[PDB]
Design a protein around this ligand. Structure first.
Ligand SMILES: *[C@@H]1O[C@H](CO)[C@@H](O[C@@H]2O[C@H](CO)[C@@H](O)[C@H](O)[C@H]2NC(C)=O)[C@H](O)[C@H]1NC(C)=O
Ligand SMILES: *[C@@H]1O[C@H](CO)[C@@H](O[C@@H]2O[C@H](CO)[C@@H](O)[C@H](O)[C@H]2NC(C)=O)[C@H](O)[C@H]1NC(C)=O
Lengths: 44, 49, 44
């Protein structure tokens, strides 16, 4: 999960490829104290 | 064995349907090696020398 | 999946850590005859 400078987006683990987040590159996970509580632009 | 054959990429339908033949195949596979105890077994050749 | 004496629950693969069953730690698999049928306390 990568910040942009034209907000988070997706990038690959071996190349700087900013890309909007979808369901096909992330997985559900239990919350942690270190995670970012974003509440103005919810990801799809 | 069911879960290991699941792990290799065989569907659960045929495992649900074909238990007897795979059991016979495994049994005869482990039964064939007793009579193969000869020079053809390279493991016996290695043990021997 | 586990039973305990305080309906099933979950534990990890390396510690006896009882916790209620979620979808975050299970997957859908086609039915097999060896399983346990339950019709009283359906997990979420
Ligand atoms: C986002 O909100 C969650 C929910 O409150 C925060 O997680 C809690 O943080 C406190 C601070 O130590 C812990 O005592 C709680 O145990 C945490 N809750 C859980 C469920 O883990 C989280 O810290 C917040 N994120 C940020 C960056 O502040
Ligand atoms: C749970 O219910 C299923 C559905 O009836 C049972 O699955 C069948 O069980 C019979 C005998 O118990 C077998 O002859 C069938 O081949 C099974 N069919 C399938 C699709 O699995 C299952 O056995 C039941 N389990 C328990 C513990 O009662």
């Amino acid at each position: 999960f990568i910040k942009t400078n034209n907000e988070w987006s997706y990038t690959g683990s071996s190349f700087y490829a900013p890309e909007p987040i979808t369901s096909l590159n992330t997985k559900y996970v239990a919350p942690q104290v270190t995670y970012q509580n974003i509440s103005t632009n919810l990801p799809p | 064995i069911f879960y290991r054959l699941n792990g290799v990429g065989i569907t659960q339908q045929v495992l649900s349907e074909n238990q007897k033949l795979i059991a016979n195949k495994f049994n005869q596979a482990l039964g064939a090696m007793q009579t193969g105890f000869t020079t053809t077994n390279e493991a016996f050749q290695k043990v021997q020398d």
